[PDB]
Amino acid sequence: MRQETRFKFNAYLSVSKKFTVEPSVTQTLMNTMQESSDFLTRINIVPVSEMKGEKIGIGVTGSIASTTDTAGGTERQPKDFSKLASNKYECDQINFDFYIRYKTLDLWARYQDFQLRIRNAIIKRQSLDFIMAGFNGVKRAETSDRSSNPMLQDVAVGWLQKYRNEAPARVMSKVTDEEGRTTSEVIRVGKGGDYASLDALVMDATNNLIEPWYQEDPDLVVIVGRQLLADKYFPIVNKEQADVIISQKRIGNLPAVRVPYFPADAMLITKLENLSIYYMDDSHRRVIEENPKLDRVENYESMNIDYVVEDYAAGCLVEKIKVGDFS
Amino acid sequence: MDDSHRRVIEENPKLDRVENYESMNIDYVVEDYAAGCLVEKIKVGDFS
Amino acid sequence: SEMKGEKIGIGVTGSIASTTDTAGGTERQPKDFSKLASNKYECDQINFDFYIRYKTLDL
Amino acid sequence: MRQETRFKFNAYLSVSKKFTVEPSVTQTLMNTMQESSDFLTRINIVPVSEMKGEKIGIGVTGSIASTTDTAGGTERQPKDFSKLASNKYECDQINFDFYIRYKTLDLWARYQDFQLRIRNAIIKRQSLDFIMAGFNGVKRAETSDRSSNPMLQDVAVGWLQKYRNEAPARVMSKVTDEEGRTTSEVIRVGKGGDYASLDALVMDATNNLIEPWYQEDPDLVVIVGRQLLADKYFPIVNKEQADVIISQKRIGNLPAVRVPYFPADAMLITKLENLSIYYMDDSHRRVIEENPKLDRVENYESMNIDYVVEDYAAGCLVEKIKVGDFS
Amino acid sequence: MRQETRFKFNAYLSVSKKFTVEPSVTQTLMNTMQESSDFLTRINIVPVSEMKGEKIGIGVTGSIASTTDTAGGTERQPKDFSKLASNKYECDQINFDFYIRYKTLDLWARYQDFQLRIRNAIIKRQSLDFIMAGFNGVKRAETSDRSSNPMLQDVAVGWLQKYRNEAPARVMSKVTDEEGRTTSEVIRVGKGGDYASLDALVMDATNNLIEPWYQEDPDLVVIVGRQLLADKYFPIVNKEQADVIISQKRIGNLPAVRVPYFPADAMLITKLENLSIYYMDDSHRRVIEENPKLDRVENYESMNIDYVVEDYAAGCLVEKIKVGDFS
Amino acid sequence: MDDSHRRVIEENPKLDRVENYESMNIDYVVEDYAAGCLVEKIKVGDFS
């Protein structure tokens, strides 16, 4: 439709898993950071060349077929191919900034091969930081302080908050009644609670909430923290009588993965290629400084990113889970 | 009217058909009003 | 090559010969040659518009 | 629209009375059978390459002209070019099968030039059979017996039955009244009947029933049997007083033809290129056999055909005609 | 669209003020006539090749921009580019024809260079005649007499009558009331009349009548006769006291021009390129004659023209203006 | 059905979209009605 795009389409007429445009520095750094960890491998880190606009669709499927009597009657109105619920992403900047003291710098520089170790260390410290900030982080507020927000809850809006304030009716936070708007503030799961066990929970959740299309899919994952998983699998091992059941770690007929710093009282069921992060093409600005006022060598780096779930009707999350007995 | 004949063809797969439009310019005319008459309302049959 | 003009007279006859007293004082009156009533006309447009269906086209 | 068809149409952009596709055996046999008789010459025998679908149009005419103020107003909706009443043909097989006894075979083979005579004889026996079965033959029933159906009334649905059970209100079978649904079962035509003579009958029939388009046509024929034609022209000759009136044989200001085995009590007014027969391209399967159990040499042949009237609004037929006096 | 038009348009895809079709005889004469006077220079004399059609749009503007939600909703319907109020011109012939007496011709033939002088004289006599006939001339009537119509007001329909009959509500000729259909016959302008002075008149007229598009335009002129201009500018100069105001002659904050024979009791506000005259391409037919029956050499010349103002909503005129005191 | 696959693409800027139509001819069929059965209305659970 545009000049180059019209040419490419006319040419269409007459690895395919990740997206590249041109070899630059920020793309290379992002690719390195992805290859570092393992969880970033199973996710889409997309470079975009715009400050605000439309998102692309990945793993979206909609039934497109019908039959119409074109012979003397109505016409054929085609259905849309990529029409999602709501799609408007807004990329924003976040920046890291640190310093090394002269003493520690000298101690490290004494031995050989220190630059490579420092590079690998900062890359590893950065990737896990992306994850931790993404899964937490209700809202973004300028001049973020790390006094009362140690879990990094103020950098940018995360996937969970995206689900919370962008597409409600896909979350579960209370047991209610037609007269009792809050019959139960917390979803008790136990012998006497509102469920039998986590299996029935994830089962009826994946039955009711998510759409019938993705419901029948060869790929679904139940992202859950570490406290809840261990709380479920501990009473199994604490018995007297088969140990393979600790290797696969399936719950509710669905494979389970665990990511660090995930909130303990919630779990999100979705396909692992549906959520993604977008980053501006060339915004990785990095500067050094060697001020002696505090005898420290400091550095600043800034990058423009934005987390985004592609199709909100893909997965759903349950929040405020509490296991007990409730006699 | 000479040099007035516009023929175009369209192919709209929205319906399953191929359309064709043609436009010309004509007018009928009797040369002379003499050498011609006509009778209009007749009814052959029988009467009293 | 134009509209609202004159009717090209094809197949029109008549009687043109006569006689006059040219010496008495009168003069020869040249009766018209193409004498017609309401020699004007016009032109209008007419269009044929039709579609052929795919199946029959294949046939 | 299809590949070859799209190419042929694009080429269109930048004898014409019969249809051929490719030189094959069944087409050659059908052409020979047509050239044999005379009535088959004035009819369309069309080869088709499908077991079921749409029929082609021949001799169909519909007024296509208007004028529309495209300048600031409505648009131009084109009218259809070939849209008939109902059009869905279904080809089916019929087969001939006979045998020659050894005695007759020997007697014939004794004299020279016997194969050509046999071929011409069977072709002649087959063409007239096509006609006889086409004009008669209400319905098709498997395992057709020739005990009580000597007029070949069980092979396939014929043109007359097509008119009867496909497009009613184009037939005439009873004189009725608003209170008497059957005021007269049979259409009496005589000095005291419901008419004056056959001329007035065919006249008001061609006035009322058939459509105004084909009504004003340079080609129309009144197909009638032999008994009725002779019954009409006999009292003319049986008088005492010009003999050319037997050569042209016009009735009701329309030329008249007669075909063998046509039902005596009916007549059909229509143009002689409106009705037709379709046949599959390659279905003429023929096998020989020389079993001595009954000392006869037999042969079987099968062909897939279907009779079809193209546009039902072309002609109309009157049925159950009876001439008398009716004082 | 047409052959030549489609070719030229396809070429377009892949002095600019006057129109020339082809070098001919009538176009050349019209050009040499226009070059004579100054008023004809600031006007469009267009050659057309049709006896009746639609008028070329010159100096027409409008509001064409818009914005529509194409994303899942309504479509884009373009507005027309050139759609005026009423556009149907009808050209027809007029003819002037004079004669020279033998005495005067014999006298002129003595001094050399007489043919050129006669040619220039007749050209000047025709140009001013076009003007005078165009601005006057309510209606056309065959066999036009020149006894009771000395101002040449019977040749053809003029611009003023065009405004009068084709598009009312753009002309003001009476001050009325809801009960008084004619409270005052003429628009009295004076110390006690219906207006303060001509300036306020033309000011509120150009405020109300004409359209807001042309209302704000750098090209507007108030065509007025000679009597009214002098009536307005005489009491100013007839004082005792600032003498350059006679140079430009602006009224109502608008430049004013004067043309001969313009009706004294009316004025017309509009742009000077909005009104125009069309003429047939090849209709200038001329013949000579030397009959001594009245010893005079006569000539007959005929040309097919038609006056036309392009967009009626461009300018407006006021009629029956009377200046006085009205105590 | 072989040789029945019609694909056309249209570009109508009247809306801001590019349309694509494709038509094919298919029919599902079970080979033999033997070697196959099905149970339709079941409900696992508990009863009296």
Cα gap A222→A317, rounded to integer Å: 9
State how far Cα A50 lies from the chain centre.
21
Q: After which residues is chain D broken (C to N over 2.5 A)?
A: 14, 241
Contact in structure between E65 and E279 (CB atoms under 8 Å): no
Which stretch of DSSP H or E encloses residue A316? strand A316-319
Bridge partners (DSSP) of residue D132 are none
E68 contacts in chain F (CB < 8 Å): none
- The residue of chain B nearest to residue F6, with distances taken between CA atoms, is B13
Which residue shows structure tokens 């497009």?
D167
Report the b/e string of E250-275 with b at 16+ CB within 10 A: ebbeeebeebebbbeebbbbbbbbbb
Is A67 in CB contact (< 8 Å) with chain B? no
The closest of D47, D69, D103 to D306, measured between CA atoms, is D47
- The residue of chain E nearest to residue F13, with distances taken between CA atoms, is E76
- The minimum CA-CA distance between C46 and chain B, rounded to whole Å, is 6
F21 contacts in chain B (CB < 8 Å): 13
Handedness of CA D198, D199, D203, D206 (dihedral sign): positive
Cα gap D266→D273, rounded to integer Å: 20
**DSSP-based helix, strand, coil % in chain B, nearest 5:** 0, 40, 60
Q: At what angle do helices D159-166 and D115-135 cross, to 10 degrees?
A: 20
- The residue of chain D nearest to residue B7, with distances taken between CA atoms, is D13
Cα gap C22→E12, rounded to integer Å: 69
Contact in structure between D201 and D253 (CB atoms under 8 Å): no
By residue count, chain A amounts to 327
Cα gap E20→A98, rounded to integer Å: 78
Phi-psi region of E326 (alpha: psi -120 to 50; beta: other; left: phi over 0): left
Q: Dihedrals φ, ψ of D281, to 5°?
A: -70, -55
- The minimum CA-CA distance between D79 and chain B, rounded to whole Å, is 9
Contact in structure between E45 and E28 (CB atoms under 8 Å): no
Torsion (CA) A200, A202, A207, A212 in degrees, nearest 10: -160
The closest of D269, D250, D271, D251 to D172, measured between CA atoms, is D269
- The residue of chain C nearest to residue B25, with distances taken between CA atoms, is C45
The runs of H, that is alpha helices, within chain E are: 3-13, 26-34, 102-108, 115-135, 159-166, 198-208, 212-215, 227-237, 245-248
Kindly report the CA angle at A166 between A161 and A168, in degrees rounded to 5? 95
Q: Dihedrals φ, ψ of D86, to 5°?
A: -145, 135
C2 contacts in chain E (CB < 8 Å): 50-51
Output the furthest CA–CA distance in chain F (Å, rounded).
66
Structure tokens at D80: 């259809």
The closest of E17, E35, E278, E255 to E134, measured between CA atoms, is E278
Structure tokens at D296: 């006869």
Structure tokens at E306: 């038609």
Helix (H, G, I), strand (E, B) or coil at E310: coil
Of D1, D13, D78, the CB nearest to B21: D78
Helix (H, G, I), strand (E, B) or coil at E126: helix
The closest of A89, A146, A97 to A122, measured between CA atoms, is A97
Contact in structure between A316 and A268 (CB atoms under 8 Å): yes
E66 Cβ partners below 8 Å, 6+ apart? E79
Output the furthest CA–CA distance in chain D (Å, rounded).
87
The closest of E95, E90, E86, E210 to E157, measured between CA atoms, is E90
The runs of H, that is alpha helices, within D136-242 are: 159-166, 198-208, 212-215, 227-237
- The minimum CA-CA distance between E77 and chain F, rounded to whole Å, is 7
Q: Dihedrals φ, ψ of D275, to 5°?
A: -90, 155
The closest of A170, A162, A160 to A210, measured between CA atoms, is A170
Torsion (CA) F9, F11, F14, F15 in degrees, nearest 10: 70
Q: Dihedrals φ, ψ of A47, to 5°?
A: -85, 130
What residue type is E72 in one-letter code? G
The closest of E177, E171, E180 to E208, measured between CA atoms, is E171
HSE at residue E256, side-chain half, CA atoms within 13 A, is: 22
A157 Cβ partners below 8 Å, 6+ apart? A137, A138, A139, A140, A307
Handedness of CA A253, A254, A257, A263 (dihedral sign): negative
Cα gap D85→C57, rounded to integer Å: 18
C5 contacts in chain E (CB < 8 Å): 51
Cα gap A195→A184, rounded to integer Å: 13
State how far Cα C32 lies from the chain centre.
16
DSSP string of A139-187, one letter each residue: ---SS--SSS-TT--SSS--HHHHHHHHSTTSEE--B--SS-TTSBSSE
Which stretch of DSSP H or E encloses residue A269? strand A266-270
Helix (H, G, I), strand (E, B) or coil at D300: strand
State how far Cα D128 lies from the chain centre.
12
Under DSSP, the state recorded for D41 is T
Handedness of CA E33, E35, E38, E44 (dihedral sign): positive
- The residue of chain B nearest to residue A75, with distances taken between CA atoms, is B15
Q: Dihedrals φ, ψ of E4, to 5°?
A: -65, -40
**E187-190 and E321-324 strand pairing:** parallel
What residue type is A179 in one-letter code? E
Neighbour-count burial of D259, counting CB atoms closer than 10 A to its CB (0-12 exposed, 13-18 middle, 19+ buried): middle
Of D5, D53, D57, the CB nearest to C57: D5
Cα gap E222→E271, rounded to integer Å: 8
Structure tokens at F47: 């009863």
Pairwise CB contact (< 8 Å): D1 & B18: yes
Other C-beta atoms lying within 10 Å of the C-beta of residue A322:
14
- The residue of chain D nearest to residue B12, with distances taken between CA atoms, is D1
Contact in structure between D290 and D74 (CB atoms under 8 Å): no
HSE at residue E300, side-chain half, CA atoms within 13 A, is: 4
Cα gap A256→A267, rounded to integer Å: 10
The closest of F18, F19, F26 to F2, measured between CA atoms, is F26
Phi-psi region of D65 (alpha: psi -120 to 50; beta: other; left: phi over 0): beta
What residue type is D312 in one-letter code? Y
DSSP string of A176-238, one letter each residue: --SS-TTSBSSEEEESSSSSS-HHHHHHHHHHHTS-HHHHS-S--EEEE-SHHHHHHHHHHHS
What are the contacts of E19-22 at 24+ separation with CB within 8 A?
A: E19/E44, E19/E46, E19/E47, E19/E56, E20/E47, E21/E47, E21/E49, E21/E281
Q: How many CB pairs under 8 A join B and E?
A: 3
Torsion (CA) D228, D234, D236, D237 in degrees, nearest 10: 150
What are the contacts of F6-10 at 24+ separation with CB within 8 A?
A: F6/D1, F6/D2, F8/B13, F9/A13, F10/B12, F10/B13, F10/B14
Phi-psi region of A220 (alpha: psi -120 to 50; beta: other; left: phi over 0): beta
- The minimum CA-CA distance between F5 and chain D, rounded to whole Å, is 9
F18 contacts in chain A (CB < 8 Å): 1
Which stretch of DSSP H or E encloses residue C53? strand C44-53
Of D1, D64, D77, the CB nearest to C48: D64
Contact in structure between A315 and A274 (CB atoms under 8 Å): yes
Cα gap C32→A136, rounded to integer Å: 106
Neighbours of chain C (3+ CB pairs under 8 A): B, D, E
- The minimum CA-CA distance between B12 and chain F, rounded to whole Å, is 8
Contact in structure between D62 and D212 (CB atoms under 8 Å): no
Bridge partners (DSSP) of residue E92 are E305
The closest of A34, C24, C8, D179 to B30, measured between CA atoms, is C8
State how far Cα F45 lies from the chain centre.
33
HSE at residue A232, side-chain half, CA atoms within 13 A, is: 22
Cα gap A78→A55, rounded to integer Å: 22
Other C-beta atoms lying within 10 Å of the C-beta of residue A189:
21
Helix (H, G, I), strand (E, B) or coil at A327: coil
In the stretch 14-43 of chain F, residues with CB closer than 8 A to chain B read 21
Cα gap E249→E255, rounded to integer Å: 7
What residue type is D319 in one-letter code? E
E50 contacts in chain B (CB < 8 Å): none
HSE at residue A19, side-chain half, CA atoms within 13 A, is: 15
- The minimum CA-CA distance between F22 and chain E, rounded to whole Å, is 22
Cα gap A305→A44, rounded to integer Å: 13
What are the contacts of A115-121 at 24+ separation with CB within 8 A?
A: none
- The minimum CA-CA distance between F17 and chain E, rounded to whole Å, is 9
Which stretch of DSSP H or E encloses residue D8? helix D3-13
Q: Dihedrals φ, ψ of E235, to 5°?
A: -65, -20
